[PDB]
Amino acid sequence: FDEFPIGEDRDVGPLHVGGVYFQPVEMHPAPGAQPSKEEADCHIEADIHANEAGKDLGYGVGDFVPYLRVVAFLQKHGSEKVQKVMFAPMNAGDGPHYGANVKFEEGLGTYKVRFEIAAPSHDEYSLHIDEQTGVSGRFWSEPLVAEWDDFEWKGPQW
């Protein structure tokens, strides 16, 4: 299917992060508080894989990194209003990613788009740390940031 870029891919910490958007989708179940397919403007996704620095956490380089907590913030240029969107983990036909249907609440124009990526909760995920079978890396304590300062929402491209 057709995907449109949010901006240039980013490397931040042990993650390679891409941002794409396309038409709103129907999801099962419908996640969190996201707008329906009909009410949304688009679906936005964060593609997140481990880069070379990820190998120290035990991920295979290039593999999807699960259990992250990803939140997008959208802010139209010239506006003080910031939208906070919690992404959910989900599969499309092209595999696991984090994503959301979203509305651009201040309409057409240029937005700053910022993904804040928190590590797997210490309540949810662990690392082997023994010398024999363990890893020498550790999760990051403050969320990593991938952002694009000049994303143009010029309306549906579909």
Binding interface with its own copies (CB under 8 A)? 1, 22-23, 25-31, 37, 43, 57-60, 63-64, 66-67, 88-96, 120, 122, 124-130, 132-135, 138
Q: In the bound complex, what is the minimum distance in angstroms from residue 56's beta carbon to its own copies?
A: 10
Name the residue among 5, 14, 18 with its Cα closest to residue 115: 18
The window from 41-49, 67-75, 80-88, 111-119 that contacts Zn ion (CB under 5 A) reads: 41-49
Q: Which does 9 bind (CB under 5 to 8 A by kind): its own copies, Zn ion, none?
A: Zn ion
The pairing of strands 69-76 and 95-102 is unpaired
Q: Which is nearer to Zn ion, 110 or 116 (CB)?
A: 110
- Tokens 């035990």 sit on residue: 58
Q: Whole-angstrom Cα distance, residue 117 to residue 67?
A: 10
CB 41 within 8 A of CB 153: yes
60: partner contacted, choices its own copies, Zn ion, none (Cβ within 5-8 A by kind): its own copies
Question: Based on CB atoms, which residue is closest to its own copies, 90 or 145?
Answer: 90
Distances in whole angstroms, Cα of residue 146 to Cα of each of 12, 16, 94, 135, 149: 7, 9, 22, 25, 10
Question: Where on the chain is the footprint of Zn ion (CB under 5 A)?
Answer: 9, 11, 16, 45, 47, 51, 77, 92, 94-95, 99, 110
